[PDB]
């Protein structure tokens, strides 16, 4: 069992990763500045002997002894984002260099500051021999996700839950636990080249509208880049195993829980 | 300290926090992550005991070092005054604090007047300190499920009755417990 | 290895002598705000003594075994000394595993029991009374209280000190 | 007349830019860490009342009162990727912060290679413009040659001048049908000053659209040098600069090559 | 009347200087880390509206708004060098910043206080800092250091104790302190940039001093064996000269030593 | 073989030292802020595995792990305040470094102690006495050779310049005053000898062989092959000779020729 640091672990993906790593009995250190993260996503672990929550900004230098580093800190405010993606990543690479820790960069499918984040990691690998991992994350959904990210899956759930009409090409979405398995898979693998972590199983916009409507139980009216993971299938033995129905239900539950709290 | 219980209701009426015991949801309808232990520079007009003690002392020292710059914590206020010329239940409250009233509500389910009193003492010239049955609470919560100095120097008094105050608090407690499921 | 903050003072300097007579590596930290360097100058030069011009509100990084924190003197500087200065010695204590004795009177106490409960700092709190009690006996009491096992407060009603 | 700061001003382009701004009577300050720049490139201005040379790294914060900022600070690649990346990102952020703090206009010297860190460098300038209202300018610079240029930059024009001067055979990869577009530095320098004082905050290509085949450069340089050397075996679109700035390369190739050949020859003789 | 900073103003020369400037109704400020100075030397003034004491090391940057800076701050060799170099750099830095006239208290052993001189003239030449350099000669009087080891202290100590005056024919000249202070203020408020000798041009041999002090102490003590100050420049520019006879001087100094012991 | 730090190693003396120590197979680190030094004087070693160049100012604290420290970082003569700070704060720092990492420090002082070089020596002995730092002090006399500052107002530099440029060789007085000059490789050998010796007291490193001003003028005139017109207007190394067994071995004509070559190459570059 290892000492793991998770930047942005108080967010959507980070908190779910935090759950799994705590379950495996690791010393998880979460660093978050709560810009888009919430203390609530990890508050169940506050007090636990192997967990620690630090209100810290990755733009500011951080000095801790850890074994692994999941760098997931990246949020409207373009300057703060650019500084986080660059100065923040440089710092985590500096920290991994100083304490001899492995760093996984949570990059994005949008690379087809995140682009230069990949490069910075490879700059430290090529030059300072820092063990790096680069995951190219595609569209991900689930509990604790940002409800108003304007994305097509979130809108349909919201509109369905409030009885509003569902206002309406293919979309690929993966459940968050799939991604979390993928990150952990990649982290402990020996693949240092970039790896696509997304769900290649696509569905049309209308198909999601019709599926979510049924799963919610609403009387709402309907008005008027596919991820290739053959590398992950082969190098990691990884693929999404959580069915669309099971994942959507857990997410619908979370949204439902949140909307009732705002009344 | 405005991301808290009294902090949020005081922010509300008038329209910096590390979210240690505060939450963003308490003020997010108006949208700095700063620990008051660290020196803060902005131009204005008006469980873990170590962190609590460092906050109340080093923190209050800063705000007095800020107040002085831009024009036991009680004693530090009067030290700055003399030397440097420097001048409860409700929603969003801590449920698991251990308070008698709070405990009864949790077992049964299973503040604006303070905001006025802070404002009234603030815009007044009184720097001197000013103050702002068990069964009957139990039987009332079950159904629904000395300030004389503030009366002469301020003319302020609590005007919200007891039942108006508990029901508004009960609503909040219920809302939270459903969220925990 | 013993560190005495405010050891160029009334009590600190008699405390300084007694500990230098027993041959401990005394280090006196002081800012001379109220303490006179004459009080301890007769020790300057010897191998065991060291005098450091230092204000406790500024962090102090030294390596000692015991800390006789007696630093206490303009009301604002007095409050920064009692609060921050104490937080800096408990931080020094916690950092170098030093046993700390507070010199309370008949807030800093609370910090001292905070660091014991939370960070496991060995602390000693002496509620000192009016001294001119004679100073030689107070040193006897402070030195006795440091090398004992009583964490709680002890007056120097001395029913507790006499029996413990 | 203005107070101008030039980061990387001790290098190839920056020093030529420095010459021009000094001649125009400005208070030019050069900030450089001499990682690839040379003090000789600007030593002629040292002592002059309007010039100041600072040994500074743009990765470290800098606080000086200026009106305009020419951000040319970026090492070249023949090397040290971490320092390059840190310079292009933390360096730019430092200068954008300065420009915001003192109300200064910043021209970023970007590159044609964006068609690393130069890309995210552009984005940061616009982030500051959009959010902090900082006046920014972005030049996308194409291949530039001339005096004070790095001779071993692996570039095709540098190699031909070198091999010709040493009587070595001029090596041509392939059939030499590939085309290369090169601008003299005083042209680029002219584009940069124009762009700075214009009101075009969108990226502007500064390059020489006049192309020539590899074989054409080989033979021209061969003749201009006067050697018995043997021959062995992204085009800049600048209509935006031509229209918004009234700028175009006006220095003929021959005049520019003679001057570059001179610099190389003077340097090679000093290394003997 | 001006805002005067005096570094080392709690020392021997420093403190008598603080006495005059305070008596003249100035706003004096002492910055001192107490390395070889004592609070009782200036305790007389603490609490006064125009006096302020600061326990401060000049090796650490200082930022106060003063008009004139008397830089007198100066066993432990490394700390002394740091104090005399960095310390002086800081006060010259301070003076450049708040436009103050700095007077350096240099010594006659210049014939690193030499470099402190050279720094003051580079800040004058290059940054336009008004500077005053006093080359100070051997001084004695009240509040002087009994155990410093100089020929005059040992000859009062050993006289007063009854111990033999230890003598190692060569000549020394000594001025009284109230005379060095009068000439320090006179140099500050003058227009002389170049260094000016502050001393007493009356040499006495080493053995002469030992028998002299004896007849002043009047104790049963025996004797057992084992750069002349030119002040003409200070005369004509400053109108300053030692006015205190040696005899009266040594008496006042013995009265300090005898009271202490 | 040791890890050696050379401050100011991009200067005249420093780069020639750097060459020698790199040839001897040491791990040489050059620290310089290029205020009077030039990267070209050392660039041939950049890329080599045992060489590292750091653009650093010794007035700023430096933390490196080394065995020996050659402290040559001091500008030549303009800006007095920066010279003063480098010689004092710069030295305090390099001694502070030496104390922290246990390194032997050689200070390059000057014969002018017969500015800031005097007090630089004292600081070294303060650290030796108080902090047990192993220190060495070389009192360097006038040195000439390739890579030297040409416009240092020095009598030999001026004579080569004026001769190379066909200008008249101006000689003040009758030119009967005498000057002693050493070639740089001689000075370097002395420095390495002084560094690896056990002599911690100051040691003069100079060429005791003196010549009159007019003698240098006429020799330099002849060695250049110029038609320049002539117009009109001491190092004691016996301790170095005995303790280190060192003495200058490079003849004057040989040293002057190599120096004349350097000046000549430089003036042509200034065309
Ligand atoms: N969410 C997706 O579907 C998706 C898609 C592609 C890529 N990704 C990648 O996955 C990672 C996790 O994203 P998410 O969807 O959980 O977003 P999120 O906002 O839930 O997670 C970001 C977390 O980082 C923290 N943070 C941001 N800036 C910080 C700073 N300067 N200092 C300290 N903490 C800071 C925030 O407070 C938040 O807790 C992201 O980095 C993103 O690039 C996510
Ligand atoms: N509510 C009551 O009945 C009551 C009773 C007695 C005293 N008080 C006083 O009234 C004040 C209001 O209490 P509340 O009910 O709003 O508590 P709260 O916990 O809701 O709010 C306190 C806020 O201060 C912030 N904070 C704490 N330590 C900090 C630090 N070191 N740096 C930055 N921010 C920090 C927390 O994040 C929190 O938001 C409290 O300070 C307390 O001292 C309240
Ligand atoms: N008998 C009494 O006089 C009496 C009565 C009640 C309480 N006490 C307590 O006993 C303790 C000893 O008191 P004392 O009379 O010996 O004190 P004192 O005033 O004689 O000595 C206090 C010492 O602390 C030093 N000091 C003050 N502030 C400092 C700072 N910020 N940093 C470093 N040094 C600093 C002073 O220079 C002085 O040497 C005190 O802490 C006081 O609270 C004493
Ligand atoms: N010259 C070309 O052909 C060409 C082509 C495309 C783009 N550009 C752009 O033009 C700009 C200037 O190019 P150049 O050929 O003059 O480059 P150059 O390599 O000759 O000079 C860059 C200058 O900046 C200095 N510098 C480097 N890193 C620094 C740091 N971290 N802090 C402070 N100073 C630093 C270097 O020493 C050098 O003087 C570059 O940014 C380059 O991207 C040039
Ligand atoms: N009086 C003489 O015999 C004599 C003779 C020649 C020269 N001088 C010069 O006159 C000046 C005054 O001498 P003095 O006899 O008063 O000496 P002194 O030792 O009595 O005075 C020195 C004062 O400087 C202070 N000091 C020392 N280091 C300090 C630091 N780092 N920061 C702040 N304060 C510091 C000490 O606390 C002390 O008060 C000295 O500079 C000395 O060089 C004196
Ligand atoms: N050659 C001589 O004639 C001679 C005579 C007497 C003494 N010396 C001494 O020999 C040493 C070498 O002198 P030189 O002739 O090589 O002169 P130089 O000017 O060529 O060497 C000084 C070197 O130190 C560097 N430097 C200056 N300030 C610095 C700082 N703050 N940080 C880092 N580097 C800095 C300069 O860039 C330069 O490379 C000097 O200490 C000088 O005092 C030389
Ligand atoms: O005059 C200045 C002001 C800013 N900075 C640097 O530029 C960075 C970015 O500035 P910004 O305003 O974005 O950051 P902030 O000061 O608000 O934290 C800062 O970290 C500073 O280090 C600078 O070099 N010169
Ligand atoms: O004061 C000192 C001397 O001032 P100066 O301006 O000459 O130095 P700088 O501030 O430029 O570093 C700066 O450290 O402490």
């Amino acid at each position: 069992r290892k000492r793991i640091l998770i930047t942005g672990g108080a967010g959507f993906v980070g908190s779910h990763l935090t759950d799994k790593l705590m379950m495996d009995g690791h010393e998880v250190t979460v660093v978050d500045n709560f810009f888009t993260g919430r203390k609530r996503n990890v508050e169940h672990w506050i007090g636990h002997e192997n967990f620690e929550l630090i209100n810290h900004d990755v733009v500011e230098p951080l000095y801790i002894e850890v074994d692994q580093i999941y760098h997931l800190a990246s949020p409207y405010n373009p300057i703060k984002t650019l500084k986080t993606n660059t100065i923040g990543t440089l710092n985590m690479l500096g920290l991994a260099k100083r304490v001899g820790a492995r760093l996984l960069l949570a990059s994005t499918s949008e690379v087809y500051g995140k682009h230069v984040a990949e490069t910075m990691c490879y700059a430290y690998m090529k030059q300072e021999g820092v063990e790096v991992r680069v995951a190219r994350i595609f569209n991900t959904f689930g509990p604790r996700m940002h409800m108003n990210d304007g994305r097509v899956v979130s809108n349909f759930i919201l509109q369905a839950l409030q009885g509003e009409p569902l206002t309406v090409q293919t979309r690929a979405f993966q459940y968050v636990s799939d991604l979390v398995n993928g990150l952990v898979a990649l982290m402990n693998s020996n693949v240092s080249s970039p790896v696509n972590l997304g769900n290649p199983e696509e569905h049309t916009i209308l198909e999601f509208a019709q599926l979510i409507k049924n799963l919610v139980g609403s009387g709402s009216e309907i008005q008027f880049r596919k991820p290739d993971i053959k590398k992950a299938k082969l190098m990691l033995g990884w693929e999404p195993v959580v069915p669309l129905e099971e994942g959507l239900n857990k997410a619908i539950h979370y949204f439902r829980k949140e909307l009732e709290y705002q009344a």
Side-chain angles (χ1 to χ4, degrees), chain A:
Chain A
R1 289 179 289 270
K2 303 175 294 293
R3 292 168 303 185
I4 299 173
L5 170 65
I6 309 175
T7 69
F12 171 48
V13 172
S15 61
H16 285 290
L17 176 64
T18 291
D19 290 335
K20 179 171 183 180
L21 295 182
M22 283 297 297
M23 293 276 184
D24 299 347
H26 301 276
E27 287 194 12
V28 176
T29 299
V30 167
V31 164
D32 200 286
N33 72 343
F34 305 114
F35 184 70
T36 61
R38 295 302 300 256
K39 217 157 177 259
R40 71 176 70 100
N41 294 342
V42 292
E43 65 178 0
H44 41 285
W45 294 121
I46 302 183
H48 191 280
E49 289 181 357
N50 294 341
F51 180 79
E52 183 179 6
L53 177 62
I54 307 170
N55 188 354
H56 183 79
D57 192 327
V58 289
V59 179
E60 303 301 319
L62 179 68
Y63 305 103
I64 62 182
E65 201 72 14
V66 291
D67 301 316
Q68 295 181 327
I69 308 177
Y70 293 85
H71 189 45
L72 278 60
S74 58
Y76 187 84
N77 185 3
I79 294 185
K80 185 177 177 165
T81 300
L82 289 171
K83 288 164 85 168
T84 295
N85 287 321
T86 58
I87 301 176
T89 300
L90 280 173
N91 284 7
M92 304 316 294
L93 287 171
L95 174 63
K97 173 192 169 187
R98 192 183 71 92
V99 307
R102 181 174 306 173
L103 184 142
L104 181 146
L105 174 67
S107 193
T108 181
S109 56
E110 302 286 340
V111 307
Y112 291 111
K114 285 306 204 184
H115 187 279
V116 76
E118 299 189 17
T119 307
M120 289 182 302
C121 293
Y122 290 130
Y124 272 85
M125 184 190 75
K126 156 179 156 56
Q127 188 182 335
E128 296 294 332
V130 171
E131 300 178 354
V132 300
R133 302 294 187 261
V134 168
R136 300 207 171 130
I137 299 169
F138 287 70
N139 292 346
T140 306
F141 73 97
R144 302 173 187 159
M145 78 177 301
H146 302 291
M147 305 177 308
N148 311 283
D149 60 347
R151 195 165 284 181
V152 55
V153 162
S154 302
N155 294 347
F156 284 167
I157 299 181
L158 283 176
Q159 294 165 4
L161 278 177
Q162 292 174 332
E164 298 174 353
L166 265 61
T167 62
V168 179
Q169 284 300 324
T170 48
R171 286 296 182 269
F173 280 81
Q174 64 174 359
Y175 185 73
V176 64
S177 67
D178 282 326
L179 168 60
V180 167
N181 289 328
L183 296 178
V184 180
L186 183 61
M187 167 65 90
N188 302 276
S189 76
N190 291 323
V191 183
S192 58
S193 62
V195 169
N196 293 341
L197 296 180
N199 178 256
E201 179 197 38
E202 285 191 307
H203 301 268
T204 63
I205 303 291
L206 179 67
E207 203 164 341
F208 279 113
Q210 296 187 295
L211 174 56
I212 289 174
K213 172 180 172 59
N214 298 341
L215 290 185
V216 171
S218 180
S220 296
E221 184 177 321
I222 308 185
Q223 299 181 345
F224 299 89
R225 188 61 154 86
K226 175 186 170 69
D228 180 35
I229 60 163
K230 67 172 175 181
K231 182 178 182 180
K233 284 160 162 287
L234 289 174
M235 305 282 268
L236 305 176
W238 176 91
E239 55 176 336
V241 295
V242 184
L244 187 55
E245 178 183 8
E246 190 197 345
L248 274 179
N249 279 332
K250 291 186 178 177
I252 290 172
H253 189 267
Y254 166 77
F255 278 65
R256 186 180 304 180
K257 184 174 68 67
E258 288 284 339
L259 286 185
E260 291 177 359
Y261 181 81
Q262 302 175 5

